[PDB]
Design a protein around this ligand. Structure first.
Ligand SMILES: *[C@@H]1O[C@H](CO)[C@@H](O[C@@H]2O[C@H](CO)[C@@H](O)[C@H](O)[C@H]2NC(C)=O)[C@H](O[C@@H]2O[C@@H](C)[C@@H](O)[C@@H](O)[C@@H]2O)[C@H]1NC(C)=O
Ligand SMILES: *[C@@H]1O[C@H](CO)[C@@H](O[C@@H]2O[C@H](CO)[C@@H](O)[C@H](O)[C@H]2NC(C)=O)[C@H](O[C@@H]2O[C@@H](C)[C@@H](O)[C@@H](O)[C@@H]2O)[C@H]1NC(C)=O
Ligand SMILES: *[C@@H]1O[C@H](CO)[C@@H](O)[C@H](O[C@@H]2O[C@@H](C)[C@@H](O)[C@@H](O)[C@@H]2O)[C@H]1NC(C)=O
Ligand SMILES: *[C@@H]1O[C@H](CO)[C@@H](O)[C@H](O[C@@H]2O[C@@H](C)[C@@H](O)[C@@H](O)[C@@H]2O)[C@H]1NC(C)=O
Ligand SMILES: OC[C@H]1O[C@H](OC[C@H]2O[C@@H](O)[C@H](O)[C@@H](O)[C@@H]2O)[C@H](O)[C@@H](O)[C@H]1O
Ligand SMILES: OC[C@H]1O[C@H](OC[C@H]2O[C@@H](O)[C@H](O)[C@@H](O)[C@@H]2O)[C@H](O)[C@@H](O)[C@H]1O
Ligand SMILES: [Ca+2]
Ligand SMILES: [Ca+2]
Ligand SMILES: [Mn+2]
Ligand SMILES: [Mn+2]
Lengths: 237, 237
């Protein structure tokens, strides 16, 4: 029961996507998760983008869980080096029809006053009390406190290619981050049992957030643009 | 406990390498695993390169197994498209002081008359009776019949960047293959328990092989050059 799709660019007001909060599609077709005005990224911003149709990751009847592969390119430009950019972006899987969560270090996927389960791969740029040095790739399950973490050096404003893959048979979720201009490769993997954390049908998308006002630092910001995206899932049941 | 090494290029008569059979270091500093004469790759060739000192992947005392990361660049040039190039190169871990094994589809690591255990990541270019379509990346444990396999399109004579990583905690062995000139990314991962297949101390290196004479095809050949190599392992024990 293979479901797939592929965006090589985002057309003005896509009918296939659900934009939430600050998330919007620029004129030259890039998906801007967080707010940016007159070419400058703003603080206190939060946006999500979900694929309109829900996907089935597992079937209670057969018991089978799906295997999927997703690839996307993103770009994070950090105009203000000091004191520290924030907060990063995540690719995530959550239950259908959920609301944007807390911003800042929560990327907009975690909501303390009404937590919903989720699996996410984060590209963290700000170091919270629970974070290892940044920037880092992290694998998150129901929490923003990563199970596994790996550090990476960002290519400011450059392009990044990400490949996230999940094998239902081995339950291995491996992610690859490549910065073509620098020729650097970062890899990370962990075991995650989707069947054990998520409902049969879920939503897949991105979420990002800039510096929280409580930090009292307007320079705590950056862009979180998604250039293209393809997803593919195969449920044998 | 940490051991590591890096090779930005290879020197003629490198003291920390162990060249075996056809393996030799070219003047312009590349490591040629298989024979190549007058700029042309020969058939019936087999060569290996091992890191001189042995590495400890696990400690029987504490029971701890090591985590390691290795990165290398290689290049495979296929001068003769038809009838078929052969056979490929592999990165491998084996017991200390082993002799080159059978050539051809065995890459020089498997010896039917005296099989020794080994873990290897293969870059297979010839399709044997036990192979899926080629070329393909495969994860091998004690056998040349891969546990997991993924197909990839080679960049003839181009450069390839490989990243192999192993987490002792999850027992996940993930490999990434990137062809910078084409911008393609191939990923594969599987669970391997080193402690269960290998001795406490091992040797790490490369091995490659060109077409076997029994195939009666001199065009069954290609180059197997390693351009650079870095290795790092950690044993909390
Ligand atoms: C917020 O980012 C601004 C641009 O990155 C910083 O301003 C720049 O600061 C440089 C030295 O830090 C200075 O040479 C530049 O001329 C100046 N450029 C701009 C766009 O004003 C700013 O730095 C601090 O605050 C500003 C207002 C100045 O007073 C600087 O001297 C300060 O270092 C950054 N502010 C923060 C939150 O640190
Ligand atoms: C082994 O590789 C050789 C070099 O690529 C092949 O020769 C080339 O074959 C082409 C077609 O296969 C032909 O257009 C080229 O002119 C030729 N190049 C030269 C001068 O060597 C060789 O091909 C065999 O020999 C040629 C003359 C034809 O009879 C082909 O049909 C033959 O396959 C390759 N031999 C094998 C075993 O495939
Ligand atoms: C962060 O964004 C929210 C939503 O756009 C704004 O309401 C915040 O503005 C501040 O709070 C509101 C209620 C209002 O009092 C306004 O004047 C405040 O500036 C904004 N936070 C900040 C501090 O910019
Ligand atoms: C393949 O290479 C090995 C070692 O490099 C040779 O020993 C093989 O055999 C030798 O060459 C053949 C032609 C024959 O003369 C034999 O007596 C030699 O031992 C070689 N095989 C081939 C076909 O080249
Ligand atoms: O300013 C950006 C930052 O603000 C929030 O947290 C501020 C943070 O400041 C640090 O210096 C302190 O150590 C820490 O305790 C405070 O929480 C926000 O949580 C963070 O994600 C980011 O927006
Ligand atoms: O030609 C190079 C090739 O030689 C051996 O395999 C030959 C192969 O020929 C096929 O036609 C048959 O179907 C198969 O049974 C034979 O094995 C060698 O084993 C292989 O790795 C490669 O070098
Ligand atoms: Ca953070
Ligand atoms: Ca083969
Ligand atoms: Mn984090
Ligand atoms: Mn194979």
């Amino acid at each position: 029961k293979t479901i797939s799709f592929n965006f090589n660019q985002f057309h003005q007001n896509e009918e296939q996507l659900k934009l939430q909060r600050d998330a919007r599609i620029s004129s030259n077709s890039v998906l801007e998760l967080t707010k940016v005005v007159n070419g400058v990224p703003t603080w206190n911003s939060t946006g999500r983008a979900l694929y309109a149709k829900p996907v089935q990751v597992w079937d209670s009847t057969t018991g089978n869980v799906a295997s999927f592969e997703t690839r996307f390119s993103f770009s994070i430009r950090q105009p203000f080096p000091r004191p520290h950019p924030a907060d990063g972006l995540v690719f995530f899987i959550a239950p259908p029809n959920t609301q944007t969560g807390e911003g800042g270090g929560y990327f907009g996927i975690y909501n303390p006053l009404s937590p919903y389960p989720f699996v996410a791969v984060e590209f963290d740029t700000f170091r919270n009390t629970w974070d290892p040095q940044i920037p880092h790739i992290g694998i998150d399950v129901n929490s923003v406190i990563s199970t596994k973490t790996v550090p990476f050096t960002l290519d400011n404003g450059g392009i990044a290619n990400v490949v996230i893959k999940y094998d239902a048979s081995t339950k291995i979720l491996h992610v690859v981050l490549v910065f073509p201009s620098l020729g650097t490769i970062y890899t990370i993997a962990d075991i995650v049992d989707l069947k054990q954390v998520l409902p049969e049908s879920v939503n897949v998308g991105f979420s990002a957030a800039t510096g929280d006002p409580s930090g009292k630092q307007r320079n705590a910001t950056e862009t979180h643009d998604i250039l293209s995206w393809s997803f593919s899932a195969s449920l044998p049941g």
